[PDB]
């Protein structure tokens, strides 16, 4: 679906409302903003490979712009000039204070709020790569992913907001509908991921 | 979101109220003040590395300005002049009375209300560093972190206060909404903390 069909469907299923059209757009943007803030991150918010170049003597690497989380089946990889690389390992900061002053290529990291820290402090310019989840507004894709893949969740959520202001009791119903849609969306994510995968112990 | 969008959304979802605009700002500041007082501290309240210089013969180091709690995966580190350091260890005060008069570099500490105590009393000026949680009004950032990451919790809290004054019943609905939002925020913080981390026994 697209924005026009979304607005038309939201207006139709809210009681064939016709006067309001701008509030629907406002609460449709706010619905996406609210959904991005919750704990569950769908698969379509995963970014592409991004590389960062940094100066010598700074261990702090700022977090990418729309960072929500770090991809679990992903890693921070150092790309050496020759094209080879190693995967850096995450530990807590307390655990990485032994290394201050030991010298070499970077080998470990910690995330502390807004900064990735490379504790084996490089003495020369480096380059790292990362895969992570991002807010949509920052994705480099043609249309909002949400519109294509999670359209029903979006409609219900928008309706709740609009109705809650008018004080209808229908709202709770639409919140339950949205909760069911999100519950179903979570299962697909797993299925999509776990498809054609065989697990061996050890 | 920002302050203007927050006020607009709070006014809209409270029943399309239009007369009140200053009370919304007042109870939006009070909402943040109330949330900072509770037990749960989000990740965006973590400060940066701060250093303290102190005179010889004073073991008491005052607590940093907005101290809420310290950061567990962190430590108080003594930075020696050469750039090297050691991590000081926390014990209760009773436990640290053996040390009175034994002499050397500081090695342990206790937190008693407003003060950090270095019991191996230094005989020369020192310098320590710490990472800790802070009240937002005292962080160095550009915009309140809460606005960006916790906007929907805030809306609900404000709506609750306002309605509670009117004595409306709807207030308990919005408190439940805020509780659900905080519950989801806790899980999001836990997921963000534990990503890309492998645990080995021993």
């Amino acid at each position: 679906m697209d924005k026009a069909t979304l607005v038309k469907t939201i207006a139709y299923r809210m009681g064939n409302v016709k006067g309001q059209d701008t509030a629907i757009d406002f609460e449709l943007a706010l619905s996406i903003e609210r959904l991005e803030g919750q704990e569950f991150v769908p698969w379509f918010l995963l970014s592409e490979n991004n590389f960062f170049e940094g100066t010598a003597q700074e261990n702090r690497i700022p977090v990418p712009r729309g960072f929500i989380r770090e991809y679990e089946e992903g890693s921070l990889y150092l790309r050496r000039v020759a094209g080879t690389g190693k995967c850096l390992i995450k530990k807590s900061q307390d655990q990485l204070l032994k290394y201050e002053g030991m010298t070499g290529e970077p080998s470990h990291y910690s995330l502390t709020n807004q900064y990735f820290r490379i504790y084996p402090v490089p003495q020369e310019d480096f380059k790292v790569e990362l895969l992570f989840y991002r807010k949509s507004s920052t994705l480099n894709v043609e249309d909002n992913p949400w519109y294509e893949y999670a359209a029903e969740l979006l409609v219900a959520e928008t309706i709740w907001a609009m109705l809650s202001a008018r004080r209808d009791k229908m709202a709770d119903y639409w919140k339950s509908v949205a909760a069911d849609q999100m519950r179903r969306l979570t299962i697909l994510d797993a299925e999509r991921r776990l498809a054609n995968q065989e697990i061996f112990m050890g | 979101m920002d302050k203007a969008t927050l006020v607009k959304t709070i006014a809209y979802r409270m029943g399309n109220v239009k007369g009140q605009d200053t009370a919304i700002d007042f109870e939006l500041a009070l909402s943040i003040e109330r949330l900072e007082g509770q037990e749960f501290v989000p990740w965006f309240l973590l400060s940066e590395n701060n250093f303290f210089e102190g005179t010889a013969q004073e073991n008491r180091i005052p607590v940093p300005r907005g101290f809420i709690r310290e950061y567990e995966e962190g430590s108080l580190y003594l930075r020696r002049v050469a750039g090297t350091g050691k991590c000081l260890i926390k014990k209760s005060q009773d436990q640290l009375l053996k040390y009175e008069g034994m002499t050397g570099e500081p090695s342990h500490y206790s937190l008693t209300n407003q003060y950090f105590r270095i019991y191996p009393v230094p005989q020369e000026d020192f310098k320590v560093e710490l990472l800790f949680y802070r009240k937002s009004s005292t962080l160095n950032v550009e915009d309140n972190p809460w606005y960006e990451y916790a906007a929907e919790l805030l809306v609900a809290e404000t709506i609750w206060a306002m309605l509670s004054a009117r004595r409306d019943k709807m207030a308990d609905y919005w408190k439940s909404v805020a509780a659900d939002q905080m519950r989801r925020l806790t899980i999001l913080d836990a997921e963000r903390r534990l990503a890309n981390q492998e645990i080995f026994m021993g």
Partner: peptide
């Protein structure tokens, strides 16, 4: 009393892997 803060990391932008 005497607490001071560290200056921010100057380099600030990540780039991209193109489609």
């Amino acid at each position: 009393y005497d607490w001071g803060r560290p200056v921010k990391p100057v380099g600030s932008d990540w780039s991209t892997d193109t489609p």
